[PDB]
Design a binder for this molecule. Structure first.
Ligand SMILES: [Mg+2]
Ligand SMILES: [Mg+2]
Ligand SMILES: [Zn+2]
Ligand SMILES: [Zn+2]
Lengths: 863, 102, 56, 76
């Protein structure tokens, strides 16, 4: 009862005459300002549009009433403009008198057999189509008409010719009539059409010459009230206007020429009806100059939104929905034996309370509005089979959306948890997939209705089912910033939590009763809890994993592994054993997105219920540690003593004179040019590298004279928004300010700013800040930084154009591709684009960082 | 050239970024000055009208709003003269004279 | 030996829809929720009679 | 002066006999016209001497599945 296929073709006169409701003969419209009903083009058993129901037997009032087609018996045949070039390509490729494709038996036999090998590719079938055309177009001796010399054709816009013979060496051009052409196409047998671009059953050539013109229904020609008549109707009026004149002149006297003039005129009018923007055809305009837009101009030319707020106290798959939004958005629930009581209490609570309802739909289908009247007599013998539109309940399937919708991860299924106030609450680890922050970002909320839709979203789009990103073999939903810092503090060498802290705060997670909390590792200094052990209270009793932490570098790289070929004296190489955290500290390496080593493992091995649990309980774990201990950045965190200051000062002076020596050398034409680049570019390139070298060195100096064990540094080295590239900019120096590559030059005719000497190519002159954000920028530097800062604005905002467009292109190219059940990626036209997807057939969302089953890992699993 | 004319930070976000900007605190816009008193004082100080000139290389070429009125004798002489004239309050402050050097 | 995600979702939806339009549910007695969760619990017990005919 | 042949980015091209052809087209349940295709103008085809009707069996090293065999029809 749904659409398998659609098979296009060309309408036969018979069809148009049979599918017609009445023969249109009177060239007129409505008329006028009162009583709009005639007997030709308007509702003469054809279609309804005014508030009056009368129609073609089907009655069917103006409301809901599919339009009926009509027809026009053309007094003479008329070439269809859309087929003109095709009709031409057909005429001079086939034989008149004959009906053959002017090809030898051999040619047909091997051509058709070369035509079946291409029977699906629309692009590659035209090459052979035109090739065939030209091969027949050159011959004049067809194998099915004793050959009678074929007068080549001419064309356009809708006229045909044939340079025949009658004299001798002459080449007069016999004119071509639609009747002649059509009756000449009617000879071409069904056997030859396949060798062309036509069908014996779907698209006969003779039908390309219209003998009957199908009239669009009333519903497709609506009148645009102020009435602004429909264009189609007007042009049609002209067409019938000439058609009737023609037929009336044929029935009477026949001076031939008269009939020819009128025939060609009719031809013009139909040509315009098909396409007003045609070539060689004067656009039929309305009395204003404004061109009529016909057919070729016709087919051409439950949610919510609000601000978002964080909530690490709700489940990762849950969504906070303001109860007001919950009272507007409703769900269709058919009353059955299990919710009979609930729904009755809901509808009785009315549109008020909190668990109420707004509408009710009885089995007949009539919607009942619970506002007016009262929830009393309305909520009676409901019986099973009705339908209540109840307000959003805690747990309902709901789609959360944030635009722009880059990857699929932008729309995820959530579980409504109705809460007051007026914002959407999003659990914090689900921020990376949405790419949302908070400053002012707003998101969309969708409420699906049909049970199939809700289920489908709940089974396939639920948050927990998409912790890992399909782009790369790793988790997308994880720790963000505090989760990282909290994981570090919780898993530190000196992590000793008094009973008060452990006991009271484990309630942010769960899991204790008996052999979980036990037993207090340290009673040395005092009876206390080691953080490693408290963290250990979550991981299952069989995951043994080991991977170097972020600090496993520099001369602190080391190693000292030891395989099994128990004490504890390790730190870097994080070692977790059956839930027990032996060594290591939690950071960007341990948790967080992008990574690919722990959160990854617990989702492959134990994917749905466990993964969400480990995620959910960890945030609240890590958060309370951070909160109860105190975590801040002060202003002294970036301060360096006088010693580092004097050192940096001497460094920037050195770099300055390095640049001057380069300039003084350039002035005297002391050559020394770089190999590839131009001389002027050599100077610039050498300076930029010289200054960049000095910049990194200044930053290297900065990381020494600053305590590496205070809060700020932890964040840099840990895994909560960090980058040595920015640290150098905050304390040491920002560096060279550039504009689309080259240095800052665009200014006055002789310099950048009016504070330097004309031609000064010095360090400070061509835009180089020496001071960082701490020490403060000078008037010049502040301006230079602004000139260089405009880059990020323009660049980042411009990239969107190419990203969006490029993606939109490749999306509109691959959107059809699926994995067939035989494990094969095939285009929608049955073309094996890839025997077994991705060569191996392993979904990138389910592979171990590209590897088709991480073999080294599976083997180790032997305990 | 925006230094002291356009705000380096005041820029609306979006496609309007860079196109539309704001006037600096330290910035005035020219009022109106009829070319009469201008021309008159100009010639009167040594500008040699075009109705005569060759000029090139008259070692000079003077312009008024793109209109080459004429030439004088020494360049720095004219620029310093008109400038100091303006500083003495003898001529309107809205008159600017620039000596391009090439 | 198992189902694919899409097949699971499809089946669940189908059963839930069957339950909505009437059609007694297999072993469930003490519950108190929508047809969806009914089909969901029914699936957790592997009693959903809906079979996926795979083209092979 | 040597040759191309299984070199830089060139996989093991082979020609199919009627047997493996029919069987292969039977396995994937597809017609002759549904395969990716090569041209007779393709250098790797003229080197191996392929005719407009052959189905080249291509063996390439894949950094994911290791060894993969593709198939294509020689055309123009
Ligand atoms: Mg953000
Ligand atoms: Mg934001
Ligand atoms: Zn009707
Ligand atoms: Zn013939």
């Amino acid at each position: 009862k749904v659409i398998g296929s659609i098979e296009f073709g060309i309408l036969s006169p018979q069809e148009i005459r049979k599918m017609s409701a009445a023969e249109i003969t009177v060239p007129d419209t409505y008329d006028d300002d009162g009583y709009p009903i005639e007997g030709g083009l308007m509702d003469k058993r054809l279609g309804v549009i005014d508030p009056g129901l009368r129609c073609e037997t089907c009655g069917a009032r103006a409301g809901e009433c599919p339009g009926h087609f009509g027809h026009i018996e053309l007094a003479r045949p008329v070439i269809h403009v859309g087929f003109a070039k095709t009709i031409h390509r057909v005429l001079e490729s086939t034989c008149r008198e004959c009906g053959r494709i002017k090809l030898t038996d051999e040619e047909i036999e091997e051509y058709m057999q070369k035509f079946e090998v291409m029977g699906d590719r629309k692009g590659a079938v035209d090459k052979l189509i035109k090739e065939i055309h030209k091969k027949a177009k050159e011959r004049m001796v067809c194998p099915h008409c004793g050959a009678p010399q074929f007068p080549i054709k001419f064309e356009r816009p809708t006229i045909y010719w044939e340079l025949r013979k009658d004299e001798e060496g002459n080449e007069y051009k016999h004119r071509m009539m639609p009747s002649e052409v059509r009756d000449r196409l009617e000879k071409i047998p069904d056997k030859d059409l396949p060798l062309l671009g036509l069908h014996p059953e779907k698209s006969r050539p003779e039908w390309m010459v219209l003998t009957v013109l199908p009239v669009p229904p009333v519903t497709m020609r609506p009148s645009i009230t102020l009435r602004a008549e429909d264009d189609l109707t007007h042009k049609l009026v002209d067409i019938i206007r000439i058609n009737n004149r023609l037929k009336s002149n044929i029935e009477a006297g026949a001076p031939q020429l008269i009939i020819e003039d009128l025939w060609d005129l009719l031809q013009y009018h139909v040509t315009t009806y098909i396409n007003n923007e045609t070539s060689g055809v004067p656009p039929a305009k309305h009395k204003s100059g404004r061109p009529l837009k016909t057919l070729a101009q016709r087919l051409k030319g439950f949610s919510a939104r609000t601000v978002i707020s964080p909530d690490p106290m709700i489940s990762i798959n849950e969504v906070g929905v303001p109860l007001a939004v919950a009272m507007e958005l409703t769900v269709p629930e058919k009353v059955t034996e299990f919710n009979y009581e609930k729904l009755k209490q809901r509808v009785l609570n009315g549109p008020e309370k909190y668990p109420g309802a707004n509408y009710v739909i009885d089995p007949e289908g009539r919607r009942i509005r619970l506002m007016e009247s009262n929830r009393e007599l309305i909520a009676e013998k409901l019986d099973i089979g009705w339908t209540v539109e109840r307000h959003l309940e805690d747990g309902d399937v709901v789609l959360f959306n944030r635009q722009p919708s880059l990857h699929r991860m932008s729309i995820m299924a959530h579980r409504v948890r109705v809460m007051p106030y007026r914002t959407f609450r999003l659990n914090l680890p689900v921020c990376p997939p949405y790419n949302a922050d908070f400053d002012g970002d707003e998101m969309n909320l969708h409420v699906p209705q049909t049970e199939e839709a809700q289920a489908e979203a709940k089974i396939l789009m639920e948050v927990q089912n998409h912790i890992i990103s399909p782009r790369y073999g790793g988790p997308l939903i994880a720790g963000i910033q505090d989760h990282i810092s909290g994981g570090y503090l919780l898993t530190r060498e000196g992590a000793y939590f008094t009973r008060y802290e452990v006991e009271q705060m484990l309630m942010f997670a769960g899991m204790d009763v008996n052999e979980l909390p036990e037993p207090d590792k340290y009673e040395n200094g005092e009876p206390l809890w080691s953080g490693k052990t408290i963290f250990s209270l979550l991981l299952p009793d069989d995951l043994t994993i080991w991977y170097r932490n972020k600090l496993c570098d520099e001369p602190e790289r080391c190693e000292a592994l030891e395989k099994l070929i128990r004490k504890l004296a390790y730190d870097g190489f994080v070692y977790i054993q059956n839930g027990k955290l032996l060594s290591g500290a939690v950071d960007k390496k341990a948790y967080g997105r992008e990574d690919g080593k722990l959160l990854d493992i617990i989702v492959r091995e134990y994917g749905v219920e466990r993964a969400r649990q480990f995620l959910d309980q960890v945030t609240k774990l890590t958060i309370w540690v951070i909160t109860h201990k105190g975590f801040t950045t002060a202003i002294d965190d970036e301060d360096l003593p006088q010693e580092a200051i004097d050192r940096i000062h001497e460094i920037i002076r050195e770099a300055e004179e390095k640049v001057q020596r380069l300039i003084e050398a350039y002035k005297r034409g002391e050559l020394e040019p770089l190999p590839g680049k131009t001389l002027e570019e050599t100077l610039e390139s050498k300076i930029m590298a010289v200054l960049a070298e000095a910049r990194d060195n200044a930053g290297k100096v900065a990381e020494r004279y600053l305590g590496m064990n205070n809060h700020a540094v932890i964040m840099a080295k840990t895994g909560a928004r960090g980058k040595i590239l920015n640290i150098t900019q905050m304390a040491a120096m920002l560096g060279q300010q550039s504009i689309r590559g080259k240095r800052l030059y665009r200014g006055y005719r002789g310099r950048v700013l009016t504070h330097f000497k004309p031609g000064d190519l010095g360090a400070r002159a061509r835009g180089f800040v020496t001071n960082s954000y701490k020490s403060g920028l000078t008037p010049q530097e502040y301006f230079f930084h602004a000139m260089g800062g405009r880059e990020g604005l323009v660049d980042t905002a411009v990239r969107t154009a190419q990203s969006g467009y490029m993606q939109r292109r490749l999306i509109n190219a691959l959107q059809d591709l699926k994995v067939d059940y035989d494990g094969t990626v095939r285009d929608p036209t049955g073309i094996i684009v890839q025997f077994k997807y991705g060569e191996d057939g392993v979904d990138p969302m389910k592979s171990w960082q590209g590897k088709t089953v991480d073999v080294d890992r599976v083997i180790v699993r032997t305990l | 050239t925006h230094w002291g004319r356009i705000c380096p930070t005041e820029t609306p976000e979006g496609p309007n970024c860079g196109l539309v900007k704001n006037l600096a605190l330290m910035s005035q816009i020219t009022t109106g000055i009829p070319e009469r008193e201008v021309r008159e004082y100009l010639m009167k100080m040594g500008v040699v009208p075009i109705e005569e000139r060759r000029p090139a290389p008259g070692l000079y070429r003077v312009y008024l709003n793109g209109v080459l009125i004429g030439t004088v004798e020494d360049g720095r002489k004219l620029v310093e003269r008109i400038r100091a004239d303006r500083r003495a309050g003898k001529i309107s402050d809205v008159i600017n004279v620039a000596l391009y050097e090439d | 030996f198992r189902y694919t995600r899409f097949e699971k979702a499809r089946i669940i939806g189908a059963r839930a829809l069957q339950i909505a339009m009437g059609a007694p549910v297999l072993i469930d007695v003490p519950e108190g929720i929508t047809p969806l969760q009914a089909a969901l619990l029914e699936f957790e017990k592997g009693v959903i009679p809906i079979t996926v005919i795979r083209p092979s | 002066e040597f040759n191309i042949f299984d070199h830089v980015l060139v996989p093991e091209h082979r020609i199919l006999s009627e047997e493996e052809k029919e069987e292969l087209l039977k396995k994937y349940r597809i017609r002759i016209s549904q395969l990716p295709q090569i041209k007779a103008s393709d250098p790797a085809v003229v080197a191996l001497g392929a005719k407009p009707g052959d189905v080249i069996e291509i063996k390439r090293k894949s950094p994911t599945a290791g060894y993969y065999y593709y198939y294509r029809l020689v055309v123009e």
